[PDB]
Amino acid sequence: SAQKAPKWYPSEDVAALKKTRKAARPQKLRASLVPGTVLILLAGRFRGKRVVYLKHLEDNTLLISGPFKVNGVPLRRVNARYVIATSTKVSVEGVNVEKFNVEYFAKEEIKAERVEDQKVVDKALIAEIKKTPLLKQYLSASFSLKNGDKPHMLKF
Amino acid sequence: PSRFTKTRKHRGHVSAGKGRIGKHRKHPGGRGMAGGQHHHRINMDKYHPGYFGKVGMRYFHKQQAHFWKPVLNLDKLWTLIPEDKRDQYLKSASKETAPVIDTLAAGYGKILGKGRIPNVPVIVKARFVSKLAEEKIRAAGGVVELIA
Amino acid sequence: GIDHTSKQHKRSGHRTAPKSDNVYLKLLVKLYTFLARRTDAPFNKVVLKALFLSKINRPPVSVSRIARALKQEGAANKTVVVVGTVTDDARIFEFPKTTVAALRFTAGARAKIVKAGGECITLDQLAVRAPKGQNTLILRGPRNSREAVRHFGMGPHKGKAPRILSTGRKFERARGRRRSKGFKV
Amino acid sequence: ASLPHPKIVKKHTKKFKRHHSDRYHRVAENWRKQKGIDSVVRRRFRGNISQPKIGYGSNKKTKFLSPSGHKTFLVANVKDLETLTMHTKTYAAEIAHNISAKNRVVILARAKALGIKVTNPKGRLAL
RNA sequence: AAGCGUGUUACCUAUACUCUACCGUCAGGGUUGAUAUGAUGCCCUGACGAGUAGGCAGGCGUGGAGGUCAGUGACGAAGCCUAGACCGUAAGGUCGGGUCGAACGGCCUCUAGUGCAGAUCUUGGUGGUAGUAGCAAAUAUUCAAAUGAGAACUUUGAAG
RNA sequence: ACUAAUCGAACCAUCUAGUAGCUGGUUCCUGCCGAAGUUUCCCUCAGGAUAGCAGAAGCUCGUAUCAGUUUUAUGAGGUA
RNA sequence: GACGUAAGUCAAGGAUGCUGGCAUAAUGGUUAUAUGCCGCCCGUCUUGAAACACGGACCAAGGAGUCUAACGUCUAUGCGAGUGUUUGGGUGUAAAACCCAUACGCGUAAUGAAAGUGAACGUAGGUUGGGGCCUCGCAAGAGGUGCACAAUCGACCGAU
RNA sequence: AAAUAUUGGCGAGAGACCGAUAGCGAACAAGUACAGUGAUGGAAAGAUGAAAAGAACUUUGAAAAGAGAGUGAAAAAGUACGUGAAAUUGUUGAAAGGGAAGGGCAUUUGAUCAGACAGGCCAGCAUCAGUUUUGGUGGCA
Ligand SMILES: [Mg+2]
Ligand SMILES: [Mg+2]
Ligand SMILES: [Mg+2]
Ligand SMILES: [Mg+2]
Ligand SMILES: [Mg+2]
Ligand SMILES: [Mg+2]
Ligand SMILES: [Mg+2]
Ligand SMILES: [Mg+2]
Ligand SMILES: [Mg+2]
Ligand SMILES: [Mg+2]
Ligand SMILES: [Mg+2]
Ligand SMILES: [Mg+2]
Ligand SMILES: [Mg+2]
Ligand SMILES: [Mg+2]
Ligand SMILES: [Mg+2]
Ligand SMILES: [Mg+2]
Ligand SMILES: [Mg+2]
Ligand SMILES: [Mg+2]
Ligand SMILES: [Mg+2]
Ligand SMILES: [Mg+2]
Ligand SMILES: [Mg+2]
Ligand SMILES: [Mg+2]
Ligand SMILES: [Mg+2]
Ligand SMILES: [Mg+2]
Ligand SMILES: [Mg+2]
Ligand SMILES: [Mg+2]
Ligand SMILES: [Mg+2]
Ligand SMILES: [Mg+2]
Ligand SMILES: [Mg+2]
Ligand SMILES: [Mg+2]
Ligand SMILES: [Mg+2]
Ligand SMILES: [Mg+2]
Ligand SMILES: [Mg+2]
Ligand SMILES: [Mg+2]
Ligand SMILES: [Mg+2]
Ligand SMILES: [Mg+2]
Ligand SMILES: [Mg+2]
Ligand SMILES: [Mg+2]
Ligand SMILES: [Mg+2]
Ligand SMILES: [Mg+2]
Ligand SMILES: [Mg+2]
Ligand SMILES: [Mg+2]
C-alpha cells in the first residue's frame, strides 16, 4: 500500500436542491420605451444606426425594423439596456408584428421568408415615415458623439 | 521517552524555556542545602520548621529489634483466625471452647484497643496489651494470657 | 476591539471524557451519555460525570461504609451505587442483604456482599433495571483522607504535615517546632 | 466526472517562503517562524512577508481537492486500485513514483476498465 | 493665501465600526427501537481570534525496533538536479522529466546520540580582494656558437 | 632580569569535562492562553529564597456568592 | 407568514431563469521583467537596535536540557487492607517467556526527649449547608434520608 | 576450597550501539607520517568494474596529451576511477540595469504549464434575497 486507506469514504449520493422561491416575473421596461419610438443601437454590427422600436418580445428583447430599405438594418432583436430611447416617435399602427417572436429568430444565405417579411413590414413603415419631413434621412444617418457632446447633459 | 518531552517542542526557540533575562546558569543560589540559614531561610522556616538545632537524648548503638513491637487492634483481632473456620466460633459464642489467638506468631507484640469485637469469648495470647484492649476482651468473656 | 470582561477561549475545566483508554469504560460512558441525554433523571447525569473521574477522585468505598449507609431509615432496600471500587472491611461482622452496583469489586468485598445474601452488579446491569436510577444510593469514598492531602497547604501555624522522608527525633523537631529552640512555628 | 463541488478558493496561492531564504543560500525556503526579538517579519511591519496562520485554511467542503474535483489517493498495485472502485467520483488514483513501467501498464488498463481517473497516466511511457 | 482666527458643509481614508463568506478556538446543544450501519462520528446554535518571557495542546520530519500492507524495486530502490505539475495555513507530502545502480516505503505502536543561520562554534571545501600587493639590499652584464620542440638564465669561446 | 621565541614562579602529563551569581549560543510547524522588573529576608545590590503576576490539571456544584460601578444610610480623614 | 372563498400561489427559514461566445493557453497557475505605492540586517543583551553596540565573507557535514539515584504534584493501569513474581529458587524453544517459599520494604497507630502509654458515652456524636435518592404533588414546591466536601462545637489517643 | 572482583591476557557468543568529520587516536604500511632537546604531542587517508576486459590500431603534436577506433551493461565507471550536492566558476540561451541588490500587494507583457464536452471557460440580460449608496416625489406634526 502506497497510501493506507480512508477508513470510511464520503458518500457518492448526490443531494437534491432545496426548493427555491424565485418565481419568474415579467420585465417592466423604462417608460421611455414605447413602440414606434426611434432608438439608437449602441453596440453590434449596426453600431450607431437609428432604428424603429416595433415590438417587445417575450424573451425581454426589443424587436426593431429600422427599415432595411432605409439604412440596411433588418428585422432583428436588440437588448433593452443597449439602446437610446429618443423623444420622437413614429406611428406603428399599420404593421403586423404578431408572427415575429423568439421562434422566428431561433437559430436551429438569407431565407426567402425573411426577405419577404421585411418588405411587408417596412411598406407600412416607410410610407408613414414620409408623413413628417426629414426622418428618412435622419434614420439613414448613424449617430456619433462630437468634441464636446456630453451624454449626461444631452437630450434625446 | 524522548519524543514526548518539551525539549522537542523547544527546538527552534532560542532559550529552550529558560528565559532571555534569567539566562539559565550553573548554580545561581548555591549547591544542595546551601544557605539554609542565610538566603534560603524563608523556605526552610516555612516548609521545614525544626530542621536546624538539637533535640533530646542520643542513643549510642541503637538496635531496632529491641523496640520491635507491632500493634494489633481489637477490630482486627479476629482476622488472626482463618477465614473459613472463623464463622464456627461466631456461632455458639460460649466458653469451654474458645478460640486461642496467639498474636505473637501472627507477628504482633502489643494488642491495642481500637475496639468493638463481637461478644464471642476468645483466648488472646499476647506479649503486651493495653488496659482498654484487655477490658473489651474480658467484657466479651475472654482472657488475655500473657506470653513471652 | 472588545473590552473583554473574561478570559477568551476559556475551557470549562471539567472532564468531558475519561482520560483512560479502557475500551469497556468507554462503553459505559457511551451508554450513560445516551441515558443522560434521553432521560431527565439527575442520577444519569451524576453517574456520567463520575465515570470521568480520576483515580484519586473516586476513593475506595468500604463495605462497612456501604453498610452504615443502610442504617439510614428507608435506605435498606435501596441499591447502593458506587462509581469506583468497593473494598472489603474486616472490622464489621454483620452485613445486610442488599444490591450493590459498582465499577469494581475486590474479591473480599464481592465475597462478603454475596455471602450476606446480596448481589453484585455492574453499572450496565444497573442501567437496565434502574434506567432513571430509581431507588438508588450513590456513595462516595473519603477524598481528603489521602496521605498527599496531609501536606497540602503547608505553612506556619497551619498544623499540616511536612514533606519528609525519614521521621523520628533529629528530623524537624527542633528550632521552629518548640519554644526551647528559638520559636514554635 | 467528479462529484459537484463549489468554486475552489485557495486564499493564498503563493508559497510562504522563509525570510531571507533569497538573501543567504544557507537559509532554505522551507518556512520557519522568526523568533527574533527585533524581527520586522515577526512583528508584522508593513511591506514584509505574510506569515502562515489559521485564517488561510481551505474550506472543509473543498480542502484536499484537486482542481478537477477529485481527492488524490496514492496507489502502488492493482489491489490498491479497486479500493476506489465504488469511489470513482470522489477519488482519483495516482501511480506511485517507484512503480515499474511494466506495472504501470497493468494499473492504467485496470483503472480505465473501472472508470478511475489517473492523475499521472503518462509516467514511464516510451512515447 | 495654499498664512492667521472663526463658522458652515461637501469630500478622502485604518488591520477600527456594520453586514456576509471562509478558517480555527471556546461554549451550549441535537443525534440509537437502522444512530440511514465510523458517537474520539455527523450536525445545529452563539461568541471569540494582538502578543515577548513563559506554559500547554494538536501535528510535520529523521535514525533504529515489534507488527502489518503475502507493500515498491535491475522492466530500475536510494540519492541528486529540475523559474515542470498537484495537495497542506504551515512543518511538509506527492507526481512528471533527467542522472543513477541496490536496496527502500505506507499504516499501527516502541525507542532516541532525532530537525540549525549564528556560538570571534568544530572539521573540510570555496570566494571577492586579484591577475592585485609584489618578485627593487649584496656595482653587471654583453656578443656569437653548440645543444634543444623551446635558451635573458645550460655548455663553450670572446668581452666587460 | 635570565632559566630553549615561555618568567612577579618554566615546560610536559594527570587530577580535569576543575568552579564560574559572568559572556556567547542553545536546531520543526500551527493552535490557545499569557507576564514581571514589585513585597520581605539574605556578606544581599549583575544572584537567590519568599509572596505576587502566568499556564496547566482539574474538583464541588449550577446562577449562587458576588462586583477596580452607582444610590441610600451611617462613620472616619486634617490635604487643597 | 401574505394573497386567494378554497384550489393553489408568493418577494414568506440563503439565486433562479433566459441568451451568447469559446472549448483553448482564451481564463487561470508558475516564472521573468516592467509599473504604482510600500519595504533599513538578521541574531543577541537591553528601558531602548537599521545603529557610529556585539557575532556573522560563503557553502557542506557535525553541533547544545541528556542519563542515573532519591523524591513532590498530577495522570493511566493492576490489585486492594493490603501490596511489591525477577535478592534468590524452579523452569526454558535460554540474557526472553512462564512458575514460587520464606523474609523484607512501604501501608494498616499515634505520641513523647525519654522511660513509656496508646485511640466508640452516643446509630463512630451534635449543628449549619450539601449532590443524588424516597414520599406527596400536573408542575412549582413541601417533607424524609442525606455519601463526598465545607465550617463549628464536642468525644477518644499520646505529650504537658 | 566455594560463593565474590575483573576497562589487562587468551578463546568464544551477542546487541532496538556507531557507520568513514560517526565508532577506539587508529576500518587503510596507526601510536604510522610528522612536531618537539626532552618529558611528550600526534593526524589525514575506505568504495572503477562482475571481470583489467586498465583503451591494441590510426592520426595531430617535441611531449603531456587530443581526435578517432576499441573493451565494457555503462567510459554520464579511464586507477585525477560508485553516486557526485552546495559554495565557487566557464560556455550557451533568455531577461533587466542613470549612485546597490533583494522583497510585499496588484496588474501588463514575454515564456511555460495542468485540467475538460458524455457541462468545462468567460460573459450579457431579467426577476428576487441580503448589505449599502445616490436621487425624484407624496402625505402629516
Ligand atoms: Mg541565552
Ligand atoms: Mg548574614
Ligand atoms: Mg501552495
Ligand atoms: Mg528554512
Ligand atoms: Mg523590542
Ligand atoms: Mg481657515
Ligand atoms: Mg493569536
Ligand atoms: Mg513565547
Ligand atoms: Mg526510522
Ligand atoms: Mg530512481
Ligand atoms: Mg535551483
Ligand atoms: Mg553494484
Ligand atoms: Mg544531538
Ligand atoms: Mg551551517
Ligand atoms: Mg538561532
Ligand atoms: Mg566564522
Ligand atoms: Mg604589478
Ligand atoms: Mg641588485
Ligand atoms: Mg561543560
Ligand atoms: Mg575549564
Ligand atoms: Mg489574549
Ligand atoms: Mg547582563
Ligand atoms: Mg492643616
Ligand atoms: Mg498630614
Ligand atoms: Mg504572467
Ligand atoms: Mg517589481
Ligand atoms: Mg519607502
Ligand atoms: Mg545600555
Ligand atoms: Mg537587532
Ligand atoms: Mg559583548
Ligand atoms: Mg566581525
Ligand atoms: Mg546538520
Ligand atoms: Mg573462585
Ligand atoms: Mg575516524
Ligand atoms: Mg569515493
Ligand atoms: Mg550507469
Ligand atoms: Mg555519472
Ligand atoms: Mg558510474
Ligand atoms: Mg565520479
Ligand atoms: Mg552551483
Ligand atoms: Mg553611476
Ligand atoms: Mg436588490
Helices and strands, with pairings:
This is part of a larger assembly, with chains A (156 residues), B (148 residues), C (185 residues) and D (127 residues).
Chain A lengths: L36 E5 L8 E7 L4 E4 L3 H4 L4 E4 L3 E7 L22 H18 L5 H6 L16
Antiparallel strand pairs in A: 1-2, 1-5, 2-3, 3-4
Chain B lengths: L5 H4 L31 H7 L23 E3 L12 H5 L9 E3 L7 E3 L10 E4 L1 E2 L1 H9 L3 E4 L2
Parallel strand pairs in B: 1-3, 2-4, 3-5, 4-6
Chain D lengths: L39 H4 L27 E5 L2 H4 L9 E5 L5 H14 L13
Parallel strand pairs in D: 1-2
The structure holds magnesium ion (42 copies).
Chain C binds four RNA strands through helix 1, helix 2, strand 1, strand 2 and helix 4.
Can you summarize this structure?
The PDB classes it as ribosome. This is part of a larger assembly, with chains A (156 residues), B (148 residues), C (185 residues) and D (127 residues). Chain C is an alpha/beta fold and 185 residues long.
Q: Could you name the key traits of this structure?
A:
part of a larger assembly; 4 chains; B: about 150 residues; alpha/beta; 3-stranded parallel β-sheet; 4 helices; D: about 130 residues; alpha+beta; two-stranded parallel ribbon; 3 helices; 2 strands; binds magnesium ion; RNA-binding
CATH topology title of chain C: Ribosomal Protein L15, Chain: K, domain 2
Number of helices of chain A: 3
SSE pattern of chain C: HHEHEEHEHE
Helix- and strand-based class of chain A? alpha+beta
Oligomeric status: part of a larger assembly
Provide the β-strand percentage band of chain A. Answer: 15-25%
| Largest interface pair | B-C, 19 and 22 residues
Radius of gyration of chain C (Å): 22 Å
Please list the strands of the largest sheet of chain A in the order they lie side by side. 4-3-2-1-5
Looking at the overall shape, the CATH architecture of chain C is Ribosomal Protein L15, Chain: K, domain 2
Number of helices of chain C: 5
Distance between the termini of chain A: 76 Å
Tally of structural domains of chain C: 1
Helix content of chain A: 10-25%
PDB class: ribosome
Keywords: IRES initiation, eEF2.
Entry title: Hypopseudouridylated yeast 80S bound with Taura syndrome virus (TSV) internal ribosome entry site (IRES), Structure II
Chain A: 60S ribosomal protein L6-A
